[PDB]
Design a protein around this ligand. Structure first.
Ligand SMILES: *[C@@H]1O[C@H](CO)[C@@H](O)[C@H](O)[C@H]1NC(C)=O
Ligand SMILES: *[C@@H]1O[C@H](CO)[C@@H](O)[C@H](O)[C@H]1NC(C)=O
Ligand SMILES: *[C@@H]1O[C@H](CO)[C@@H](O)[C@H](O)[C@H]1NC(C)=O
Ligand SMILES: *[C@@H]1O[C@H](CO)[C@@H](O)[C@H](O)[C@H]1NC(C)=O
Lengths: 189, 190
């Protein structure tokens, strides 16, 4: 069969997850001798798969893209995700990515939020409240001091949302990441 | 030794082996003194005496480019392959210098698409089939490509603004104007 019709019956057939990232899972399955490598953004039906212990109930579906400038990582990182990459030894295996089949290998890269998100200053609430709006179905934001471990703090929102800043965020170091954007949260005493 | 990029840049004197060559960077490892340094660079200079240097490009293109995330858009936006640094699935990372910047991740090769800010506009002068691309970046690329066409090493780099006159062979409905983060279908016309 085709992997994108075979990698979905994980519950049915013997499966084994190989890697759990911040935003998708890499698992394979065995259907009558054949082995099917594949990656998905949905944890539905991967509990009878071997190595499911650290699997989250849900995977954040925000828009994410790999980070290419290694300096930007400490500031823009919001976790890791799995991606299809070309094999260096010219031996790509067949792997299905989010129900899309292709030949390649699987690699885990650090990622950053991406997409169109507009960040304005609110008027209804206190001076430390902002209004983030995005045209895409689901957009992620994250308040992060550069170098913090807050990979699961990525909040998702459809349409618009509002964020009142807390005092611990109000030092000049914290930055608001929303898709392609990064705004400094001003220091105010 | 503590500063890794120095042995990386001194490959011409050391024993270097090219481990891979993409469309825009080269992956090579050097051994200064019984210690192997893994390395990725965009300058083919100093690697000619490395092993597996036969297909080394004369020079590499500097146009901004990023990995293709939606594998369905690969056939359309592909501009070649480029090496990037990633993490190890077995959690066995090893130090690697990327464009003179040192880190502990592993090396991956990924089909890549043009990126950057590029503005496509009508020329309003001369031939009707003439368009103008505008980019504020120092370096920006553009490439007329048939969804599928193998035009990897034929991407034109333009600083500031540039103008391109559509050839008649390119004026069928099977061609896109690729420039930075933008793609625009050229018209099937006669
Ligand atoms: C289980 O796999 C079958 C192929 O046998 C495919 O139709 C589908 O992905 C799964 N079942 C259903 C009812 O969708
Ligand atoms: C993998 O490559 C083979 C040829 O080597 C090709 O026939 C096959 O279609 C490719 N896999 C997919 C999912 O297209
Ligand atoms: C590169 O190698 C030379 C020896 O040829 C050595 O002096 C040093 O490691 C490098 N060159 C410098 C630092 O000028
Ligand atoms: C990561 O690499 C740097 C230099 O490449 C090194 O200083 C550091 O110790 C490495 N990390 C670990 C956990 O060893």
């Amino acid at each position: 069969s085709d992997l994108p019709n075979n990698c979905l019956n994980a519950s049915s057939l013997k499966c084994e997850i190989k890697g759990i990232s911040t935003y998708n899972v890499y698992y394979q399955v065995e259907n009558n001798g054949v082995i099917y490598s594949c990656v998905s953004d949905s944890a539905e039906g991967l509990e009878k798969c071997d190595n499911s212990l650290n699997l989250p109930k849900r995977f954040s579906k925000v828009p994410v893209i790999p980070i290419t400038k290694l300096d930007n990582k400490r500031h823009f990182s919001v976790g890791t995700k799995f991606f299809i990459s070309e094999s260096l030894t010219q031996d790509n295996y067949p792997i299905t990515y989010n129900s899309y089949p292709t030949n390649g290998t699987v690699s885990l890269q650090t990622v950053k939020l991406s997409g169109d998100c507009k960040i304005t200053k609110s008027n209804f609430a206190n001076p430390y409240t902002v209004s983030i709006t995005s045209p895409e179905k689901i957009m992620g934001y994250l308040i992060k001091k550069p170098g913090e471990n807050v990979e699961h703090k990525v909040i998702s929102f459809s349409g618009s949302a509002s964020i009142t800043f807390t005092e611990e965020m109000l030092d000049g170091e914290h930055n608001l990441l929303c898709g392609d954007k990064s705004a400094k949260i001003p220091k105010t005493n």
